[PDB]
Coordinates of N, CA and C in Angstrom, one line a residue:
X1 N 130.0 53.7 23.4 CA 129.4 53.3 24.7 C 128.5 54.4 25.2
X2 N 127.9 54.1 26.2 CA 127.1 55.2 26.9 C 126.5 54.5 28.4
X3 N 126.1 55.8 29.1 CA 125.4 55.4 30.3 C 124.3 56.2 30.7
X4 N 123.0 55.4 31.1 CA 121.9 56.2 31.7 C 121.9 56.3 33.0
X5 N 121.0 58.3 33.3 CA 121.4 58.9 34.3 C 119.8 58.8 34.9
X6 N 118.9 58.0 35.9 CA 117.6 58.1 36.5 C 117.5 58.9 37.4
X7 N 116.7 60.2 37.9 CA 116.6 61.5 38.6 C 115.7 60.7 39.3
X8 N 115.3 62.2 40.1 CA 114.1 61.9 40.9 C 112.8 61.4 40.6
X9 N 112.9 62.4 39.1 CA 111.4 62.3 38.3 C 111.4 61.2 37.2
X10 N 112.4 59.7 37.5 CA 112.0 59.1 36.9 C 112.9 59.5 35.5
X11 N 112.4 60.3 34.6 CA 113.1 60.7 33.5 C 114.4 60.3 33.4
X12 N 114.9 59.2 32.4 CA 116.3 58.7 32.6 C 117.4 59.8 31.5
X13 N 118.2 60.3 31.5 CA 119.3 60.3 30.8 C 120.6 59.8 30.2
X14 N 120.5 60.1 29.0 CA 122.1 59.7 28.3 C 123.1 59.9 28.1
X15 N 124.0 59.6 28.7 CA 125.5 59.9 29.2 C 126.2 59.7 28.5
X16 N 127.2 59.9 27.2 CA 128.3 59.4 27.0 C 129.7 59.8 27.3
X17 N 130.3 58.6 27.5 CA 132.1 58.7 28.2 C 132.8 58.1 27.9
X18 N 133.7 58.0 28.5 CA 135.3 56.5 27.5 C 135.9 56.6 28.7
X19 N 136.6 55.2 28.6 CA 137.6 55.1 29.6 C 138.7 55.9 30.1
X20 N 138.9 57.3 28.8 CA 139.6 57.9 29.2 C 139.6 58.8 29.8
X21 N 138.5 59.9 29.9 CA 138.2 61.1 30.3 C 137.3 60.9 31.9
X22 N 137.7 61.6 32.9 CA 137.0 61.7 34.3 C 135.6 61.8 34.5
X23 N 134.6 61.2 35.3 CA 133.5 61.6 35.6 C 133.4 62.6 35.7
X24 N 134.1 64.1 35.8 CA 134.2 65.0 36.4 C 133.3 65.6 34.8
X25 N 133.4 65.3 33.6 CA 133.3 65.7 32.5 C 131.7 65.4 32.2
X26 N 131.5 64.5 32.9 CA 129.6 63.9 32.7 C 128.9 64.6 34.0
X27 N 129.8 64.9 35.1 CA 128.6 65.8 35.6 C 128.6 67.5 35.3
X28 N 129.6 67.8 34.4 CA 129.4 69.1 33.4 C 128.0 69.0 32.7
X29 N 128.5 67.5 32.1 CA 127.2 67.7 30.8 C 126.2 67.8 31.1
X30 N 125.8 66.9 32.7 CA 124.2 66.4 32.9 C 124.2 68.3 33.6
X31 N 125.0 69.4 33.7 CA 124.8 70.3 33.9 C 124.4 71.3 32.8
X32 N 125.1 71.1 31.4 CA 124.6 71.9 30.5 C 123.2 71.2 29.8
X33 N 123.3 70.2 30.7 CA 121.8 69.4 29.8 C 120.3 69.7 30.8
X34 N 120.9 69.9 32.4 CA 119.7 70.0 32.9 C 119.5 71.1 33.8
X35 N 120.8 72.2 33.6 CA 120.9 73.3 34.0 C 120.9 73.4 35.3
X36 N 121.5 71.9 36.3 CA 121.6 71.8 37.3 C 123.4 71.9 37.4
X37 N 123.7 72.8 38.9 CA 125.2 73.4 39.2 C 125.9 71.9 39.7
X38 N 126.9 71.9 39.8 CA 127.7 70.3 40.2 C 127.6 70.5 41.9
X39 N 127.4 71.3 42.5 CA 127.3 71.5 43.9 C 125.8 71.0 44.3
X40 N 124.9 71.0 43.3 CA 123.6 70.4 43.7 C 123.1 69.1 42.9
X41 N 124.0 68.8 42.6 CA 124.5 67.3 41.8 C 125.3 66.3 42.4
X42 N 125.0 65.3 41.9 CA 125.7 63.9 42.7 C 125.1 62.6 42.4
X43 N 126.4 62.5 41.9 CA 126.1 61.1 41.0 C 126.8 59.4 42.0
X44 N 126.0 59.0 42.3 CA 125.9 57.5 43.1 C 125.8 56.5 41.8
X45 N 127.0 55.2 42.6 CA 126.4 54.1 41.8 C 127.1 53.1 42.4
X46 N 127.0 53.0 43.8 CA 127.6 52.2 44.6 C 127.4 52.9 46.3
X47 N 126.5 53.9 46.1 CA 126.8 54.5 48.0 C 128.0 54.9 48.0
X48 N 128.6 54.3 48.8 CA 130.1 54.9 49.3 C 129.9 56.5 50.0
X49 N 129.6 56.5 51.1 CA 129.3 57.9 51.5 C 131.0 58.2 52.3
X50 N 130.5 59.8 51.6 CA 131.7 60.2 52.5 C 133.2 59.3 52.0
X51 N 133.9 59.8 51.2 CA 134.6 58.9 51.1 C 136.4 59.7 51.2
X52 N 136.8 58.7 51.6 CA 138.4 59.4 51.9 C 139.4 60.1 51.1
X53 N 138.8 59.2 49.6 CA 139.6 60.2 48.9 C 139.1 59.2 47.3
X54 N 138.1 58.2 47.1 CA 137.9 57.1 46.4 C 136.9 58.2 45.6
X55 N 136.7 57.5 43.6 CA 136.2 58.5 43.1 C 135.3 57.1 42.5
X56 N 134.0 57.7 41.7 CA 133.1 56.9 41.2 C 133.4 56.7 40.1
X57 N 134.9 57.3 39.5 CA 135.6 56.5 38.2 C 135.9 55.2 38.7
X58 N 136.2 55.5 39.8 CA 137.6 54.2 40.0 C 136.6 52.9 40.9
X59 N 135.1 53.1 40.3 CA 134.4 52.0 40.5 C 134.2 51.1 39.1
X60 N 135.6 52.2 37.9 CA 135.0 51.3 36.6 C 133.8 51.7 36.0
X61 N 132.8 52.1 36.4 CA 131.5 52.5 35.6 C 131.5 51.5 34.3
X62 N 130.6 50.5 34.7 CA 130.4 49.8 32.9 C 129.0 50.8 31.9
X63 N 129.1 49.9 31.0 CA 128.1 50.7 29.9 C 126.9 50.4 30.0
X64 N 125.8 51.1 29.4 CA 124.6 50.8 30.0 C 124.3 50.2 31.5
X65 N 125.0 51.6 32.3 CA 124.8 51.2 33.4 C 124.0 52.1 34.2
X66 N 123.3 51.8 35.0 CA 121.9 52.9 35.4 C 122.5 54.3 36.8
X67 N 122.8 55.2 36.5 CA 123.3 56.0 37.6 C 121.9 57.1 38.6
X68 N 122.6 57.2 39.4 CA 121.6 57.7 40.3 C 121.9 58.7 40.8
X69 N 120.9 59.5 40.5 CA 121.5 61.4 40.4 C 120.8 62.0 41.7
X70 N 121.5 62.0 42.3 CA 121.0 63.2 43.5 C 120.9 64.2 43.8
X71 N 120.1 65.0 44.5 CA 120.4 66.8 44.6 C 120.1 67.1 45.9
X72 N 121.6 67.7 46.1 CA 121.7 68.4 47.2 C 121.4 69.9 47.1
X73 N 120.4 70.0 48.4 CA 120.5 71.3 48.5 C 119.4 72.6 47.7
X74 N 118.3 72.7 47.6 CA 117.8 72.9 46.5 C 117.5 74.5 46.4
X75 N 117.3 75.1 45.5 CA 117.1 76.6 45.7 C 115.4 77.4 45.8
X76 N 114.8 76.2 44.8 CA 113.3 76.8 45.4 C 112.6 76.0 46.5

C-alpha cells in the first residue's frame, strides 16, 4: 500500500506505511525526503485542530489517500 503527500507547491509525494507502524514514522520520512524538521511539519487529513489527545492514525488513513502537508513556522 501507499499514500500521497500534496505540499504547497503542488508537488505530490509517496508515502509508504502499514497498519502497523505510527504516523509518527512517515512524518520522519517526508523529513529525510524533504529535509523539512517535524516541528515545521504537519500532516492534516481531516482538520481536527487542536486536538485533546486524538491522533491522525486513529482516523484509519486508507491507501491512496491524498494528505495535506503543512508548515508551520518558516525559517527563511
Amino acid at each position: 500500500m501507499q499514500i500521497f503527500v500534496k505540499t504547497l507547491t503542488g508537488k505530490t509525494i509517496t508515502l509508504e506505511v502499514e497498519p502497523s507502524d505510527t504516523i509518527e514514522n512517515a512524518k520522519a520520512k517526508i523529513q529525510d525526503k524533504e529535509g523539512i524538521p517535524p516541528d515545521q511539519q504537519r500532516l492534516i487529513f481531516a482538520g481536527k485542530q487542536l486536538e485533546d489527545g486524538r491522533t491522525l492514525s486513529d482516523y484509519n488513513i486508507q491507501k491512496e489517500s491524498t494528505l495535506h502537508l503543512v508548515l508551520r513556522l518558516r525559517g527563511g
